[PDB]
Amino acid sequence: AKKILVTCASPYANGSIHLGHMLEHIQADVWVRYQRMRGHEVNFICADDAHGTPIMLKAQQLGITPEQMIGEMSQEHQTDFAGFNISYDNYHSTHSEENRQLSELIYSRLKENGFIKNRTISQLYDPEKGMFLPDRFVKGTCPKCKSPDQYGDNCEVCGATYSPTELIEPKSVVSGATPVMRDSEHFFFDLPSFSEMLQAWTRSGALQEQVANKMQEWFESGLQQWDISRDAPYFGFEIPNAPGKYFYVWLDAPIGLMGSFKNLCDKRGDSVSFDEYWKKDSTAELYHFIGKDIVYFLSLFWPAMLEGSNFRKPSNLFVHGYVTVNGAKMSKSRGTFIKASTWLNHFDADSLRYYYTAKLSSRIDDIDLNLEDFVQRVNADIVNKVVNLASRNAGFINKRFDGVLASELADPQLYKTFTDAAEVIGEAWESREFGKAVREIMALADLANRYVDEQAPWVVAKQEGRDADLQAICSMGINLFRVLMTYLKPVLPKLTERAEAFLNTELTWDGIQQPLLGHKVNPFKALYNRIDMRQVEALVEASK
Ligand code: MET
Ligand SMILES: [Zn+2]
């Protein structure tokens, strides 16, 4: 009955999707699929973050228009997300008419409300190329150790940090020309004006404890005005009434989420939902699944921008940690920096979805993809605990009972134990305590396989006149499988489809209250196969 709008962070258009991105999109998708299972109106949307100096320069280097380049990466990104079954209702772009109009609208409202200031700053400028240089586009000699060819604000030899203006014999990364300091008028967003409102939100109890604690650090350091303009040449939106000035990519980026929803509503011919979800009096819920590296933007700048332009603010922010492989940050040399596209050449999407889900929680701690454990866990839990309930019982039903399940539950009490667990498991999905949900589900799977072993169908099957017993036992196992797959439906979309084909029924959350009795099931190849370390080693090799 609830109206919910969910988004993830918008991936940058100048890079491919990797396992880090996938943790976020998978976490959000599991939550979204669960919400849909409970009957809510859900809108899951995203967009590619396509503006900025890096993108402009990359396109120039490739000899193509930025429009062509971002279009190609958008398609690549969407192919990867589709491959992992991320159920987006809309995937748009920050480079769109919807975002242009909303960005100009919000800026105009902020300016009229007195939240935009003008001030001149001094910045390194490449006079040959004719453009201001962001820090990482300046290279030179470290002022401390004198090591050559260091980029930006830090030295990778001695570890010193400094303003690029301190680099000795500075060179433009773009042209090789010597940059010089040049003045430029910039527009600033008055974030400090929203300090009290933001502090009140921080102590409201909605945000994760770890996020609130971090925000207190930011309030202690002191909020500052935010430089939201960038000079031409740039790839982005030009600021109204300010020739040669553009909105900094980070200003239009989150607005692009609003733009994606407007685009969805417009394509649907829906003229009422946009305002119903974004106006101040909205009763709809808005959630953003994001990584800790962008919390400053989504928890401080974003709510302030919305407040200042008369729009509703996020109902909550769901923050996740970094993704490590084998305990450490992804390493290109070790072949642990894995692309989403590469992953799918070696494993299915469900395997990673399951592993991440089993490790996820409501906290912002990092999630480790230990490859050896990945093989062990997928084989133990998916193949040997859950799918085993179907694979060890389906054969007898199809071969000796014409595919028809028993007319009654052999063990109603045990079945009730399984359905009684729905409340706690659903609450775990709801609260994002994914690891807890998986543990509960697997504990039930253990009870199910214990039941089958207690009944010993491999013994019953060879004994005279025990056909009724065999059908009863195997049917019971299949019904337990039906329940477990329902609880896991948000996690394993593809295996779920195969399970539904086998069971001849769509799995619904409430449906488990009615077991399958005197019901025809279909034969199947193999619902899920084992994986091994040889496959893992091949994945790593292919990633080097
Ligand atoms: C509106 S969220 C933008 C996120 C940004 N593109 C990043 O990857 O960090
Ligand atoms: Zn140095």
From Swiss-Prot:
Required cofactor(s): Zn(2+)
Positions annotated to bind Zn(2+): 142, 145, 155, 158
EC number(s) given by UniProt: 6.1.1.10
A biological-process GO annotation: methionyl-tRNA aminoacylation
Motif 'HIGH' region per UniProt: ranges: 11-21
Subcellular localization(s) per the UniProt record: Cytoplasm
UniProt keyword Protein transport present: no
Presence of the UniProt keyword Metal-binding in the record: yes
Stretches that traverse the bilayer: none
GO cellular component: cytosol; membrane
Effect on the protein of changing residue 332 to Q/A/E/R: Loss of activity
Sequence positions that bind ATP: 332
Note on how the cofactor is bound: Binds 1 zinc ion per subunit.
Subunit structure: Homodimer.
Function summary: Is required not only for elongation of protein synthesis but also for the initiation of all mRNA translation through initiator tRNA(fMet) aminoacylation.
Family: Belongs to the class-I aminoacyl-tRNA synthetase family. MetG type 1 subfamily.
Protein name: Methionine--tRNA ligase
Organism: Escherichia coli (strain K12)
Section of the entire sequence shown: 5 to 548 of 677
